[PDB]
PDB file of C-alpha atoms in Angstrom:
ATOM      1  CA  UNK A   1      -9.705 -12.902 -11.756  1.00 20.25           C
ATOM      2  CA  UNK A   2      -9.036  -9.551  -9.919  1.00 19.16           C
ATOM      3  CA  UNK A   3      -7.165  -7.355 -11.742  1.00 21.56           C
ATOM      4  CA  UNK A   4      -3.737  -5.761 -10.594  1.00 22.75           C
ATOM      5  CA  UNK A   5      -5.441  -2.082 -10.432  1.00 20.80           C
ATOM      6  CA  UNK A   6      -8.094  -3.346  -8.594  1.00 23.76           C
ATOM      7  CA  UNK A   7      -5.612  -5.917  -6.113  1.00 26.08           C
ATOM      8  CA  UNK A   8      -3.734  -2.575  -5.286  1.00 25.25           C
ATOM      9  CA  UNK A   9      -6.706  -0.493  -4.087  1.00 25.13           C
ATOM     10  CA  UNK A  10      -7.629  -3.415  -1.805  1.00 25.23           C
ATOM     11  CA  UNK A  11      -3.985  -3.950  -0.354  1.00 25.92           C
ATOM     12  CA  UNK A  12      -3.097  -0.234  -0.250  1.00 27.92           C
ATOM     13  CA  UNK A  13      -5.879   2.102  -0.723  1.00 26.75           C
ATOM     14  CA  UNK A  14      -7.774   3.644   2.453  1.00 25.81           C
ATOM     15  CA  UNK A  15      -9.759   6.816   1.376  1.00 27.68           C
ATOM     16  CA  UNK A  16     -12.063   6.680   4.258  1.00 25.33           C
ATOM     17  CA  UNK A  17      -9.809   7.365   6.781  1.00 23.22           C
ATOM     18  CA  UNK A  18      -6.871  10.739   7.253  1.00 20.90           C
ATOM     19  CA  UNK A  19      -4.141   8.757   9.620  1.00 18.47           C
ATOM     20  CA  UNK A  20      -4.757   5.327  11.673  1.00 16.30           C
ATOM     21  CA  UNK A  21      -6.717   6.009  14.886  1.00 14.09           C
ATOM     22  CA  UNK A  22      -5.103   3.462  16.568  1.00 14.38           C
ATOM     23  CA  UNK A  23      -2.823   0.810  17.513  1.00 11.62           C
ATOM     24  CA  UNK A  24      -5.237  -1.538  16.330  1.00 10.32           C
ATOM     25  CA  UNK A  25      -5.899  -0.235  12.688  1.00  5.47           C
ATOM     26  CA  UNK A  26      -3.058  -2.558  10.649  1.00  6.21           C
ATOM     27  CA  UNK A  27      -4.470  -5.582  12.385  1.00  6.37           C
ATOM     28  CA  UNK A  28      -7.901  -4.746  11.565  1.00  2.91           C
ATOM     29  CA  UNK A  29      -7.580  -3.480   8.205  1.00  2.00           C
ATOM     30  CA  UNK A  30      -4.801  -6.325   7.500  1.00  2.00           C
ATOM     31  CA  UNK A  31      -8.173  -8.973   8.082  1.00  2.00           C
ATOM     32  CA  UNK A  32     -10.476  -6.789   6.539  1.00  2.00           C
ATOM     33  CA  UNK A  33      -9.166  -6.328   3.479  1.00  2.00           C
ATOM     34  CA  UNK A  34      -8.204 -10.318   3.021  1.00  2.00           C
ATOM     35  CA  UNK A  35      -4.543 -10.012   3.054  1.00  2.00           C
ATOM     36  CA  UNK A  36      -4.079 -12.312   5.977  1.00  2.00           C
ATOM     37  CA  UNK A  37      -6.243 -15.388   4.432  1.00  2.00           C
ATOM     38  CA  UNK A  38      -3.530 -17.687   3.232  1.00  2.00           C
ATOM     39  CA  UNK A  39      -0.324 -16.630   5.337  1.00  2.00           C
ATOM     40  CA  UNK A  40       0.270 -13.172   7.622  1.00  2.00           C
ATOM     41  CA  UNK A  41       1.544 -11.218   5.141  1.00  2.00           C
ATOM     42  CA  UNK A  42       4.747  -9.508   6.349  1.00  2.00           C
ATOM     43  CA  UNK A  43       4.656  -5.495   5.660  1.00  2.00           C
ATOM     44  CA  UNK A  44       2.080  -3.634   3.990  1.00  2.00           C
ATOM     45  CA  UNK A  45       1.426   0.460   3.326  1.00  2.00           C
ATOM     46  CA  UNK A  46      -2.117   1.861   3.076  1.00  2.00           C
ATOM     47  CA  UNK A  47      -2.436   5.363   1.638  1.00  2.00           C
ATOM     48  CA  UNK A  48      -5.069   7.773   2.954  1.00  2.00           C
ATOM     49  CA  UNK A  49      -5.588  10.162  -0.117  1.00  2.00           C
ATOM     50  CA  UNK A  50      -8.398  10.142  -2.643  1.00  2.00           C
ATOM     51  CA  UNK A  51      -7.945   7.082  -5.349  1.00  2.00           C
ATOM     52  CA  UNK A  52      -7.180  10.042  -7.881  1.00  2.00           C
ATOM     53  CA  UNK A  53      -4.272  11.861  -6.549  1.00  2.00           C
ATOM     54  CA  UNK A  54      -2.720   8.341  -6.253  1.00  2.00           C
ATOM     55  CA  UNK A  55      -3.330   7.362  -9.862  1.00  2.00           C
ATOM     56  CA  UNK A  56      -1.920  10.714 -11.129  1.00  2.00           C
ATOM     57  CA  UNK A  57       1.363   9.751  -9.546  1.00  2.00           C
ATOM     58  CA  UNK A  58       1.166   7.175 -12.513  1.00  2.00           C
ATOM     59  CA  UNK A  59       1.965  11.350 -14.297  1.00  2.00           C
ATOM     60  CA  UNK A  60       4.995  12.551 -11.735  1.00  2.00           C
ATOM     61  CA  UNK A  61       8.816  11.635 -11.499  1.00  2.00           C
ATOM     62  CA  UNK A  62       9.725   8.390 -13.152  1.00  2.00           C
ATOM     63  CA  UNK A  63      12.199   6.607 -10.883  1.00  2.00           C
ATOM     64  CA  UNK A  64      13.810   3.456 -10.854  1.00  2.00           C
ATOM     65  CA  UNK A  65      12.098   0.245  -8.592  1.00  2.00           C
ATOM     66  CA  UNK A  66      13.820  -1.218  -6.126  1.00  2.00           C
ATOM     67  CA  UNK A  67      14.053  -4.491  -8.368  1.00  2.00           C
ATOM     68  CA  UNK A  68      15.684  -2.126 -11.038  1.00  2.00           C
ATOM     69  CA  UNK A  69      12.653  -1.791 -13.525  1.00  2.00           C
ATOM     70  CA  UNK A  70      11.564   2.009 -14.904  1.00  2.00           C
ATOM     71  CA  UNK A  71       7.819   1.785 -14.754  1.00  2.00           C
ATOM     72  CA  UNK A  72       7.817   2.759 -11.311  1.00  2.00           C
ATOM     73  CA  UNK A  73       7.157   6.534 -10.240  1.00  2.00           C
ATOM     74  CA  UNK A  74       7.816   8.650  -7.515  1.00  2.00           C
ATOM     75  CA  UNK A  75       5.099  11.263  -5.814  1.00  2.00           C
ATOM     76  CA  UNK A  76       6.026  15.076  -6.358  1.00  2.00           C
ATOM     77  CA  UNK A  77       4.134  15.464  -2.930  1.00  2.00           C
ATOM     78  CA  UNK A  78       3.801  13.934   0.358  1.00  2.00           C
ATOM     79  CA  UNK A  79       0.972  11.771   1.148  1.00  2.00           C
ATOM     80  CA  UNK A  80      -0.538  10.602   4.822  1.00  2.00           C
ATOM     81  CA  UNK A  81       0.647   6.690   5.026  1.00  2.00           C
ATOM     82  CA  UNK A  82       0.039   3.453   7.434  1.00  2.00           C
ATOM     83  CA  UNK A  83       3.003   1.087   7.487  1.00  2.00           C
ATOM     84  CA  UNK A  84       1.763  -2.402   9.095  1.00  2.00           C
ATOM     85  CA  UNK A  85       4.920  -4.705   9.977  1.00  2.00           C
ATOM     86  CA  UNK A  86       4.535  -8.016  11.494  1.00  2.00           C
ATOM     87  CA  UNK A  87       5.275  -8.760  15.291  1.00  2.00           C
ATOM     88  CA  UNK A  88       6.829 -11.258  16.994  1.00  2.00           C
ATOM     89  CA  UNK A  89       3.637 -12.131  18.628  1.00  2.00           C
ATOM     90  CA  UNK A  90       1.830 -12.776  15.102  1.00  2.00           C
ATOM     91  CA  UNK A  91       1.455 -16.737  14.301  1.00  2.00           C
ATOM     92  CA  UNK A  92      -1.343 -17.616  11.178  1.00  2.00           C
ATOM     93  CA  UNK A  93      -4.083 -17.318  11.669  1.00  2.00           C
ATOM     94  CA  UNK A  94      -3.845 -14.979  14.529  1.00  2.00           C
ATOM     95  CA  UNK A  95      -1.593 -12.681  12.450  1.00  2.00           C
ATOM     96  CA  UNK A  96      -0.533  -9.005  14.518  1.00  2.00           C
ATOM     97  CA  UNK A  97       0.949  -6.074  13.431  1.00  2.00           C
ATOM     98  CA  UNK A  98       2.654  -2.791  14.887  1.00  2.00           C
ATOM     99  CA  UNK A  99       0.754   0.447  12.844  1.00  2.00           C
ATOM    100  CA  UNK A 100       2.941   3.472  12.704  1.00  2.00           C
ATOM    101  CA  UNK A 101       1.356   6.518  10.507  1.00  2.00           C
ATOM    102  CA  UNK A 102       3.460   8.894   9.029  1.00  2.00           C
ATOM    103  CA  UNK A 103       3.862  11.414   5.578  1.00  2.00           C
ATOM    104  CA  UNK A 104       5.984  10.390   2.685  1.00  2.00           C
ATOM    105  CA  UNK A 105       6.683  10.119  -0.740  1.00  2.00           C
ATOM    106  CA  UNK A 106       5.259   6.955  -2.160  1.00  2.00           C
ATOM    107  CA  UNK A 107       6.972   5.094  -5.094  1.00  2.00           C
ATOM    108  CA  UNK A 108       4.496   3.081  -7.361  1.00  2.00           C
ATOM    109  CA  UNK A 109       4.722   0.738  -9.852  1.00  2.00           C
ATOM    110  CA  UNK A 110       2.009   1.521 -12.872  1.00  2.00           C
ATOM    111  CA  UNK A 111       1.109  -0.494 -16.051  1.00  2.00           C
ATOM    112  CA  UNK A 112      -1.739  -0.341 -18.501  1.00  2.00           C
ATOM    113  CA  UNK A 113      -3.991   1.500 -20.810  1.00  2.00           C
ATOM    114  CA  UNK A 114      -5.361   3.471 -18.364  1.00  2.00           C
ATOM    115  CA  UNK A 115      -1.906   3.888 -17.474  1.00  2.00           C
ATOM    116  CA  UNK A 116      -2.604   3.333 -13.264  1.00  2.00           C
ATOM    117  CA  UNK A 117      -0.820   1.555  -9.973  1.00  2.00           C
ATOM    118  CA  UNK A 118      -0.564  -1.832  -9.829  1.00  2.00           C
ATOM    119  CA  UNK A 119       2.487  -1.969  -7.436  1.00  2.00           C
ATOM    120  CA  UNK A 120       3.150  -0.310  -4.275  1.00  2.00           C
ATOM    121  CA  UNK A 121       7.382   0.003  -4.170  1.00  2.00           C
ATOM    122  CA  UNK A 122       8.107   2.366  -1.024  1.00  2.00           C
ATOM    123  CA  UNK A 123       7.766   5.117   0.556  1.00  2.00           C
ATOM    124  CA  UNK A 124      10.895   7.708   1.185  1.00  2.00           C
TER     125      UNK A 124
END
């Protein structure tokens, strides 16, 4: 089966691109990348920096998760972000989302030997 490294470069990974170019990127990249085939999934964040500087957060400020657990870490920069939230219009399959593009601090979850992302927690 996929593994969890490789399930959070396709849900949150997006080298190729700086920012979203338009209003249309979530829904597009939401299909594209196969996150939409069983149900519209309901928020997702794609992260436009090289697959490297996000792994070497895996190195930065351990934080706490949301849920409480202490594997999760905290950028020590800023990084160029998509969030992708559900409308009111979206109904499965036709699922729609509102893109809004902005610079945070991402918070990821990371396991393993490498030790690398597996979880994407928020952004702040």
């Amino acid at each position: 089966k996929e593994t969890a490294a490789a399930k959070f470069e396709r849900q949150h990974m997006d080298s190729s691109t700086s920012a979203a170019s338009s209003s249309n990127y979530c829904n597009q990249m939401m299909k594209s990348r196969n996150l939409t085939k069983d149900r519209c999934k309901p928020v997702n964040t794609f992260v436009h920096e090289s697959l490297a500087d996000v792994q070497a957060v895996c190195s930065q400020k351990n934080v706490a998760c949301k849920n409480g657990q202490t594997n999760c870490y905290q950028s020590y920069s800023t990084m160029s972000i998509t969030d992708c939230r559900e409308t009111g219009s979206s109904k499965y399959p036709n699922c729609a989302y509102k893109t809004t593009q902005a610079n945070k601090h991402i918070i990821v979850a990371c396991e393993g030997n490498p030790y690398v992302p597996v979880h994407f927690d928020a952004s702040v």
